[PDB]
Design a protein around this nucleic acid. Structure first.
Ligand SMILES: [K+]
Ligand SMILES: [K+]
Ligand SMILES: [K+]
Ligand SMILES: [K+]
Ligand SMILES: [K+]
Ligand SMILES: [K+]
Ligand SMILES: [K+]
Ligand SMILES: [K+]
Ligand SMILES: [K+]
Ligand SMILES: [K+]
Ligand SMILES: [K+]
Ligand SMILES: [K+]
Ligand SMILES: [Mg+2]
Ligand SMILES: [Mg+2]
Ligand SMILES: [Mg+2]
Ligand SMILES: [Mg+2]
Ligand SMILES: [Mg+2]
Ligand SMILES: [Mg+2]
Ligand SMILES: [Mg+2]
Ligand SMILES: [Mg+2]
Ligand SMILES: [Mg+2]
Ligand SMILES: [Mg+2]
Ligand SMILES: [Mg+2]
Ligand SMILES: [Mg+2]
Ligand SMILES: [Mg+2]
Ligand SMILES: [Mg+2]
Ligand SMILES: [Mg+2]
Ligand SMILES: [Mg+2]
Ligand SMILES: [Mg+2]
Ligand SMILES: [Mg+2]
Ligand SMILES: [Mg+2]
Ligand SMILES: [Mg+2]
Ligand SMILES: [Mg+2]
Ligand SMILES: [Mg+2]
Ligand SMILES: [Mg+2]
Ligand SMILES: [Mg+2]
Ligand SMILES: [Mg+2]
Ligand SMILES: [Mg+2]
Ligand SMILES: [Mg+2]
Ligand SMILES: [Mg+2]
Ligand SMILES: [Mg+2]
Ligand SMILES: [Mg+2]
Ligand SMILES: [Mg+2]
Ligand SMILES: [Mg+2]
Ligand SMILES: [Mg+2]
Ligand SMILES: [Mg+2]
Ligand SMILES: [Mg+2]
Ligand SMILES: [Mg+2]
Ligand SMILES: [Mg+2]
Ligand SMILES: [Mg+2]
Ligand SMILES: [Mg+2]
Ligand SMILES: [Mg+2]
Ligand SMILES: [Mg+2]
Ligand SMILES: [Mg+2]
Ligand SMILES: [Mg+2]
Ligand SMILES: [Mg+2]
Ligand SMILES: [Mg+2]
Ligand SMILES: [Mg+2]
Ligand SMILES: [Mg+2]
Ligand SMILES: [Mg+2]
Ligand SMILES: [Mg+2]
Ligand SMILES: [Mg+2]
Ligand SMILES: [Mg+2]
Ligand SMILES: [Mg+2]
Ligand SMILES: [Mg+2]
Ligand SMILES: [Mg+2]
Ligand SMILES: [Mg+2]
Ligand SMILES: [Mg+2]
Ligand SMILES: [Mg+2]
Ligand code: NA
Ligand code: NA
Ligand code: NA
Ligand code: NA
Lengths: 71, 260, 197, 183
RNA sequence: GGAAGUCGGCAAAAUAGAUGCGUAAGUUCGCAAGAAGCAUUGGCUCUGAGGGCAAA
RNA sequence: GAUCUGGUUGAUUCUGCCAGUAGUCAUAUGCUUGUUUCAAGGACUUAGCCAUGCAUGCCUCAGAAUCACUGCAUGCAGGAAUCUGCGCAUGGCUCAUUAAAUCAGACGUAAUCUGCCGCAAAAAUCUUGCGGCCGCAAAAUUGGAUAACUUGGCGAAACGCCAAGCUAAUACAUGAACCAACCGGGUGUUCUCCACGUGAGACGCCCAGCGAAUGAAUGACAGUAAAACCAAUGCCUUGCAGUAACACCCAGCAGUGUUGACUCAAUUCAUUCCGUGCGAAAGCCGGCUUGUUCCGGCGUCUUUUGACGAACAACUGCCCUAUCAGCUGGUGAUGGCCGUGUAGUGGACUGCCAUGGCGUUGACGGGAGCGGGGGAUUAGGGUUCGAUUCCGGAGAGGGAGCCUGAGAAAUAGCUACCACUUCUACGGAGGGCAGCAGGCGCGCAAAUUGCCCAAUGUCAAAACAAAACGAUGAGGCAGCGAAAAGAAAUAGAGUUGUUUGUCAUUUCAAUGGGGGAUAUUUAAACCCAUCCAAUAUCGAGUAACAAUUGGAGGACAAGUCUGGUGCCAGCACCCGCGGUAAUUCCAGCUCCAAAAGCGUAUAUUAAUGCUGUUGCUGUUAAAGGGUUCGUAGUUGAACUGUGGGCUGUGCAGGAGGCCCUUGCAGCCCGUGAACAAAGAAACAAGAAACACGGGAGUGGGUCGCAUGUCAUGCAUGCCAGGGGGCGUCCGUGAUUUUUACUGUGACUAAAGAAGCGUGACUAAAGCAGUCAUUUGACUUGAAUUAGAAAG
RNA sequence: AGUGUGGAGAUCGAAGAUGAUUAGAAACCAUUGUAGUCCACACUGCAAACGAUGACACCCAUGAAUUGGGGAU
């Protein structure tokens, strides 16, 4: 995903942009999802960066993924 | 917990008619998974035809006349499954529960000194208290002292009567396997290669005797011999060779006309 | 009763979740132990599966471990001195995990004398290092060669009270086990305690 | 409740209720083959509609397609067995040319009249419904019985029928009882 | 009991400080507004927060 | 079957709707109805209210009988009752709630709990009996209570109750030494020895089982070659080749757990466990050969992990609405820290911090809805339905709370309140049909207070049988049932007269409906099927055993018919008809259409290219915004380029040569560099350079003799090196490459939909059956498919 | 066109007035006349605001003209 916000302490918001197909019109539409991801202090990513995230146990109300690699 | 099993919800391989009853016998917990097993009552009533209904099946089973892996089992809901040896001493019946090419359960007749041998795929290896290595098999058996070369995915050929391991066949390329799950269940082939995807399902690419290449997940393969020529267990009539559907239909039609 | 589900919580959008089922026993919570310092009193709690938790209401002693010495002793809890959640827990002498306590230093002092032949209580029932076999004296020298004790713990042993951190959960197991504070962690908490006398 | 016995329809009404050409054609078919209602023609119409639909689907596919090979062989075998198409016509395109009279000629009511066991199609139907005709020694009482080519030579009077090897019929039996009682 | 008194609620009763929440029609958009309403308040023993100055 | 027709004008050509037309397991309703097969059936409205009855119990050779119970016999065998153990958290019903919920496919739990079932594990424990803590001895001959029952009974009653007196259990409690092992830790101011203390060996003492808690150490290595110095310690003999380790009783009694990854499995050390754990149930029954070790079948405590499950999490997806634009954050909103709680993760919760989190890619609010599998309709694309059989979820009048239990926030369990209710002797006591049947209401709208456990299953202490038959309205079978679906009667052949055909005659045969049975079916019946003699079995002529429902101007098949009525009555979906010659109303006749069915109403699909992605229209028919700027959004120019040579072959084409069709073989497959071995160039991270026997079924391909012999050393080598190539694991190394699409493959319950085979008499079906007719073949068959998207 | 505040107010002229016409005529015609019409500033954003024809881009046959800029004689 792409880093969308880094305003939280050790938590970042990423975006997953994708195209959804509509069968009737034989055409796509742009959709996106937002995921709260824990970010270890060993990475320091920025807005617009691309990150790889791995699924972990629930770490908060919304967090289910941990940052693994910053590209 | 769930105690019933609707006949529509029952596995299709049990071949129970949708019109004859609402329910099917729910397998109890035990050696094999509920979706991957054949109940003893189904074996004694629907397959062997020794019992006309469940009440006669109860008559046979409660007396301990049916042995599974050299042990009388009195429950019609006992979940018999793959590679199990079922013996009825009174009628002199001995067969192994295997899969044919079409994925259905098959009763492959066995001779003596063959019903004493059963293959078990190692699914887990752990350490028990006292630093005792324990191997867990596909049929729920726990082995207190397996061979030091034993690995997960390997198969242990195991003497049921004497309750001891006698040989081990490693899970490597070039070994003969039988598929126990998926669309390729019942096919017999040789391991060409195994693709490893850590954190996901490993994929085994196999090749049968005729040269057909197929694949499945590594959990569905079951090593049964060093290679296709020397198997360590008797296999069903069709020898795990999938046969073209058009050719099969033509051969059946010709055979039917030859009969009449 | 008390529940642990997310149904009553607001969605991230701020909308209200419309609940369409009754509360389940599988999501229940229990009232806190609020274990205090005092003579031992526990209450068993039958948990899911038939297992028992021990809800400690009062505790007075526990197994406290000297990590650098790889030893532990059953010692009496003397006071609660610091709690990172609030100082009200200190005021009420509540025993929870990670809180800082002061425990009797006598068993640790006595073990040091027996194991190393060094009596920390110099300059003023009690083990005497003089009554030792010559073999034990040689083992004392062997142990003493590769050994250096820190002055902070050594001073605390001399005064008879040594600070420790609770490592168990009294509300779940009914125990007040802990580990003696050492090194930087002790210096951190000593500064916290030094604040405001 | 909890009954899983399947059932389905075998006929469909025509789209336009009143067409002079269609009504006259169906009236001709009813008289020619001794049918009871238009539903018997419409049943044949739906059958042919199904066969032509799968034939069109198969012919869309390329020749070497396994589904076309297996399904195409099966339907041609079905047509040859039931006499819908001649043995010479061995192409899938000839299924498309099947007509309603082709199916109607294979009815046991039609075959019995054509074989010569009945004076007319109406005589044939009542003979079938009155347990007088057997196909391979099995009594058949359904006029819409589609006769296989291999079964054509085995059509004859039933052994249990008075016209075959059976006992006397109602008229003679009742008169025999009356003669005994009157005497 | 509660305006039945009386021309008439005259007279009297009633409301009451501070703090938090909350507040309708209408409106020249400023108000209406302390609209209306709800809640808290003592004593004691503690805890936290809000500063100055000087010193390498 | 990719289809249209009537109505705008005097006529025409359009736009456009209205009306016609067909289907619907789609409901109701009206008329009609002989036979048979297969089936929906109080969901819609009132998750409205309910009289009565039933719906969940379980005993074997194998827990407990002194019924003052029965049979026999002088103890034997049944055995009411009642303790004990298991179940009642499943089934059945319903669809009210419900949109980051539920659900579907696909994944996780290393974040957990898990009775019954499968395979396994088990060496802790100072007990008992005779004599005086001590001695002798060893098949452990353990202890208190409470039911049923007896007595007295209370109470109008209550699936309501006291008190006393007996006696059991596999109920409850207690408790087993020696036999009987291996291993380790701490010590004695104890002995026997060596040297003048990393000394050795004994004995003595305290601990050393499974599981649990805290702390400490393990849970590997895999990025370099040689020399000396000292201290101790191994060998060699009196200085380092050889040398797994280890101060004997064990000279190999783990130097080696697992994953993709673990603080996990497991082991060692220290301390702890106070009931909130741990019997060989101090248990039961058999067999013989009758056994201080006879041999089996059961039952049970604890530990462990497969299985059946439970609970949590969420990758993508799901109607209408902006006359709903902001939502969330006192009092949790988003995240962080230490805690608490949970079976476990978590703002799930306390305290303290930081301002975050969501929204025009439609948040928030509102409206309609349980979600799927699937149904209807059908060129294709679509539209629409899904209360309802199977799967998942939720509920038991409304709410909440809770005990028991492995599992319930259970409701034919409990507690309370609210709303309804029943009995009463007025003190009190009760009730929950959205289980089956059935009532009352509600409505357009939906059956019997039936029979049975024979089948299908569930529970259980339980095979069947024998004085001896478990329960089951789950389920099955019948009754009612024109929802719907399949098959099919109501007549067939003549003869005479009136090319034919109709009519008037007159004959012949056949057959069911129905009536019955030596019987068959069925748990018993009932339906089907079989038969009307097998010596011996009833029956069609107006075959009265009598077919209906809508129509006859047009759309739309069928009358210039006859009377009646006279803009009245009425018909008429639309156009219209009827005002004295009605093709239309009311009737007769005749005819048309479908037919055991046929009208009507409403909804929905096609008709409809009148919702248009495929595929609409916008000058004048409805419809380009008055103009321009402009953000989201949609869309967006070209280029890095597709190779030669040779041979054969083909009207290739414009003598020989050049270029092309196809196929075969070569290419460092541009140029350069070497004689494609090495190096150079192109490459290659699905590579390259390193380095690990704990890497490779013993270190992958390429019968006596040497170690040694206090060893089950009962072992090891019996080609070695050098150089090349291949597996396994780790490390180092880059001014490093994905996604859509497309081709294959994997994973993916049935029912349903396609589809193969199969004369259930055909068919709707079903997954069966077929053939010799035999003491059984076919090693019978039950093919294969498609199924949104996402992964 | 209309509104607000200041200007301006010749002409024309909603409202209104008068005179005709007419069965009636508080219409058309005639003589007048307020607000307006004009300007500054600020509002309003209702036109047959029309080509009743959205914007950008491509292709497209013929004759005579026309406006602006270039090239040639
Ligand atoms: K205003
Ligand atoms: K009990
Ligand atoms: K029901
Ligand atoms: K034990
Ligand atoms: K936490
Ligand atoms: K908090
Ligand atoms: K009912
Ligand atoms: K009529
Ligand atoms: K008339
Ligand atoms: K008429
Ligand atoms: K834009
Ligand atoms: K215009
Ligand atoms: Mg008052
Ligand atoms: Mg007054
Ligand atoms: Mg008054
Ligand atoms: Mg008065
Ligand atoms: Mg007055
Ligand atoms: Mg006053
Ligand atoms: Mg307001
Ligand atoms: Mg017009
Ligand atoms: Mg007209
Ligand atoms: Mg005219
Ligand atoms: Mg009949
Ligand atoms: Mg009948
Ligand atoms: Mg209802
Ligand atoms: Mg229902
Ligand atoms: Mg007994
Ligand atoms: Mg249920
Ligand atoms: Mg699923
Ligand atoms: Mg012992
Ligand atoms: Mg009394
Ligand atoms: Mg017990
Ligand atoms: Mg342990
Ligand atoms: Mg390891
Ligand atoms: Mg969830
Ligand atoms: Mg939060
Ligand atoms: Mg609803
Ligand atoms: Mg549904
Ligand atoms: Mg409803
Ligand atoms: Mg359900
Ligand atoms: Mg419930
Ligand atoms: Mg109700
Ligand atoms: Mg229940
Ligand atoms: Mg409840
Ligand atoms: Mg009930
Ligand atoms: Mg209640
Ligand atoms: Mg039922
Ligand atoms: Mg009905
Ligand atoms: Mg019995
Ligand atoms: Mg009936
Ligand atoms: Mg009739
Ligand atoms: Mg009959
Ligand atoms: Mg029946
Ligand atoms: Mg006509
Ligand atoms: Mg109509
Ligand atoms: Mg008409
Ligand atoms: Mg359309
Ligand atoms: Mg169309
Ligand atoms: Mg249109
Ligand atoms: Mg227009
Ligand atoms: Mg481009
Ligand atoms: Mg070159
Ligand atoms: Mg199916
Ligand atoms: Mg079908
Ligand atoms: Mg002024
Ligand atoms: Mg003028
Ligand atoms: Mg306008
Ligand atoms: Mg316009
Ligand atoms: Mg110009
Ligand atoms: Na995994
Ligand atoms: Na007959
Ligand atoms: Na464990
Ligand atoms: Na039963």
């Amino acid at each position: 995903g792409v880093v969308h916000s880094t305003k939280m302490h050790r938590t970042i918001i990423i975006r997953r942009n994708y195209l959804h197909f509509i069968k009737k019109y034989q055409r796509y539409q742009k959709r996106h999802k937002s995921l709260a991801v824990h970010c270890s202090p060993a990475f320091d990513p920025k807005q617009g960066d691309e990150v790889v995230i791995g699924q972990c146990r629930p770490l908060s109300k919304t967090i289910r993924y941990n940052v693994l690699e910053v590209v | 917990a769930k105690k019933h099993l609707k006949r529509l919800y029952a596995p299709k391989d049990w071949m129970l008619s949708k019109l004859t009853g609402v329910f099917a016998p729910r397998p109890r917990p035990g050696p094999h998974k509920l979706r991957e097993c054949l109940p003893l009552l189904v074996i004694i009533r629907n397959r062997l035809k020794y019992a006309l209904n469940a009440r006669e099946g109860e008559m046979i089973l409660r007396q301990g006349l049916v042995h599974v892996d050299n042990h009388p089992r009195r429950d019609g809901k006992y979940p018999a499954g793959f590679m199990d040896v079922v013996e009825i001493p009174k009628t002199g019946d001995r067969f192994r529960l295997m899969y044919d090419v079409k994925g259905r359960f098959a009763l492959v007749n066995l001779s003596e000194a063959e019903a004493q041998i059963k293959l078990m795929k190692v699914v887990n290896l752990y350490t028990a208290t006292g630093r005792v290595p324990v191997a867990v098999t596909h049929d729920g058996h726990r082995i207190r002292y397996p061979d030091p070369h034993t690995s997960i995915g390997d198969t242990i050929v195991y003497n049921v009567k004497e309750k001891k391991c006698v040989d081990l066949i490693k899970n490597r390329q070039g070994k003969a396997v039988i598929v126990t799950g998926g669309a390729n269940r019942g096919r017999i082939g040789e391991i060409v290669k195994v693709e490893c995807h850590p954190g996901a399902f490993n994929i085994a690419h196999l090749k049968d005797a005729s040269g057909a290449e197929f694949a499945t997940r590594a959990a569905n393969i079951f090593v049964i011999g060093k290679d296709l020529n020397n198997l360590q267990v008797t296999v069903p009539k069709q020898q795990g060779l999938r046969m073209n559907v058009i050719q099969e239909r033509e051969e059946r039609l010709i055979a039917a006309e030859a009969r009449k | 009763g008390i529940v642990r589900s997310r149904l009553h919580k607001r969605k991230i959008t701020g909308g209200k979740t419309k609940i369409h089922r009754k509360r389940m026993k599988a999501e229940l919570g229990r009232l806190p132990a609020n274990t205090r310092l005092g003579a031992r009193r526990v209450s068993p709690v039958r948990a899911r599966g038939g297992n028992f938790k021990i809800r400690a209401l009062r505790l007075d002693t526990g197994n406290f471990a000297w990590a650098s010495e790889a030893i532990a002793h059953r010692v009496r809890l003397l006071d609660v001195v610091y709690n990172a959640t609030s100082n009200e827990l200190v005021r009420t002498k509540t025993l929870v995990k990670n809180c800082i306590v002061a425990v009797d230093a006598a068993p640790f002092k006595r073990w040091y004398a027996k194991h190393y032949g060094i009596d920390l209580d110099a300059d003023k029932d009690k083990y005497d290092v003089n009554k030792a076999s010559p073999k034990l004296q040689r083992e004392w020298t062997r142990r003493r060669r590769n050994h250096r004790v820190e002055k902070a713990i050594a001073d605390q042993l001399r005064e008879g009270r040594v600070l420790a951190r609770i490592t168990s959960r009294p509300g779940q197991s009914g125990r007040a086990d802990g580990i003696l504070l050492e090194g930087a962690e002790l210096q951190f908490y000593l500064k916290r305690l030094e604040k405001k006398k | 409740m909890r009954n899983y016995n399947n059932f389905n329809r075998v006929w469909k009404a025509p789209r336009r209720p009143f067409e002079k050409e269609r009504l006259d054609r169906e009236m001709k078919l009813c008289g020619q083959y001794g049918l009871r209602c238009k539903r018997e023609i419409w049943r044949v119409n739906m059958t042919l509609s199904k066969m032509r639909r799968t034939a069109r689907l198969l012919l869309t596919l390329p020749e070497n397609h396994p589904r076309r090979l297996l399904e195409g062989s099966a339907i041609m075998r079905r047509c040859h067995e039931y006499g819908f198409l001649d043995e010479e016509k061995d192409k899938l395109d000839y299924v498309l040319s099947l007509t309603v009279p082709d199916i109607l000629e294979r009815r046991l009511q039609t075959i019995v009249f054509k074989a010569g066991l009945a004076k007319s199609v109406h005589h044939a139907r009542v003979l079938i419904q009155q347990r007088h005709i057997a196909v391979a020694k099995q009594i058949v009482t359904i006029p819409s019985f589609i006769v296989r080519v291999s079964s054509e030579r085995h059509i004859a009077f039933a052994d249990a029928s008075p016209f075959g090897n059976g006992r006397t019929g109602r008229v003679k039996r009742v008169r025999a009882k009356a003669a005994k009682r009157h005497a």
